[PDB]
Amino acid sequence: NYCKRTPLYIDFKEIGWDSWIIAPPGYEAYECRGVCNYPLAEHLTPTKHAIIQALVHLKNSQKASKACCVPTKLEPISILYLDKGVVTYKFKYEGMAVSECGCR
Amino acid sequence: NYCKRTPLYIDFKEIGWDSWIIAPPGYEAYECRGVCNYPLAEHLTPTKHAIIQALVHLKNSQKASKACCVPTKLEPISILYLDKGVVTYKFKYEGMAVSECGCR
Amino acid sequence: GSQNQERLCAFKISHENGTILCSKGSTCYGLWEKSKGDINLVKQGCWSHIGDPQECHYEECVVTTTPPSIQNGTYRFCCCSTDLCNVNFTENFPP
Amino acid sequence: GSQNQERLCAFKISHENGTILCSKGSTCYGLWEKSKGDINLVKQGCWSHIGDPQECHYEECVVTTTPPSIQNGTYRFCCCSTDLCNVNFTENFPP
């Protein structure tokens, strides 16, 4: 359907990264799924370029692609990980969770 | 092929926007086309989230989507446009041209 | 409290007298390392609610996930949502 | 020059004595409005090379695109890549 944030849980054990990330076992990272339809709604915070490209794609599907539904605001999570055998704590590990989706 | 910047020319007359944009007649806006393959190369400046999601998609195509090739750095162009019959010049109209593509 | 999403947690915003304030719905956490009778506290403090990790919803600090294989499976992490719940830890492993 | 991608352009970085410096490969531009014998200069200055608009490659300031239908098709824009080339304008319309 329309570009929105949708669930996506990450299990660090199952992706093979518990070798270096002690905590958490996992977290809700979310993802962005859906079509970017012209006109791009305001909550999709479209750039000027995404608006133009979306319009060209409407007129000619071969000259330009649709705007893509991607994360537009990433949020940090807490983490404990190993760095050469050193436990490292970061209350805010940037770029890990999606708070807002949009068209770009 | 791989996520890179590709040509895309905008003709303001042909998209119907010369009604309010006096200049230019058009410009090279470029676009981003290609697949985001794991592992995401450094020049694609992948976020931590795009790396994780790409990995989940590799393990399970139904649990997560690929990282999307989108503009990651937008540049401004010069513009002359009408605002309620007032000619308005901006040497830098932000968010109009693509200088760098990446995976998000 | 729960209305302002603030929580007091043990510590090994000021970290005065072994406690720390965890705002923005953050939870308490504690990391230990355990091998037979030897148990050592590594770190205590706040765990961000962003990402809503599953086992941080327990009111007690229970280790419910099998420890990572690193350092001979000795690490013991738990997070919890009551005040000073990270003072100690209880185990409930799948193995 | 061409090596440093700097260019001097007419003006209606300082805009001293009716000229202006256009760096970063920027080009000169001029906007007029014309209806029969009446011609008026609206704006002059720099045009960014970002977006590489096609008709800014002319060495002379030629209006090569049909004017926009706004204000009875009176606007006359041109951009060019030689020094002070936007002092005047020449027309070469498709119509």
Residue numbers in the entry:
A (entry chain A), B (entry chain A): 321 to 424
C (entry chain B), D (entry chain B): 26 to 37, 51 to 133
What does the paper say about this structure?
The TGF-β ligands are dimers and initiate signal transduction by forming a signalling complex with two copies of a type I receptor and two copies of a type II receptor; all are single-pass transmembrane proteins containing a small extracellular ligand-binding domain (ECD) and an intracellular kinase domain (ICD). For example, ActRIIA/B bind to and mediate the signalling from both activin ligands and some BMP ligands, whereas BMPRII is the low-affinity type II receptor for over 15 BMP ligands.
We solved crystal structures of the BMPRII binary complex with BMP10 in two different crystal forms, at 1.48 Å and 2.4 Å, respectively. In the 2.4 Å structure, there is only one copy each of BMP10 and BMPRII monomers in an asymmetric unit. The dimeric receptor complex can be generated with a symmetry-related molecule. Using the chain identities to name the seven complexes, they are complexes AC and BD, complex AB and complexes AI, BJ, CK and DL from the ternary complexes. Of note, these interactions are present in all three BMP10:BMPRII 1:1 complexes from the binary complexes, but not in those from the ternary complexes. ENG-bound BMP9 is closer to the prodomain-bound form, whereas BMPRII-bound BMP10 (in the absence of ALK1) mostly adopts an intermediate conformation.
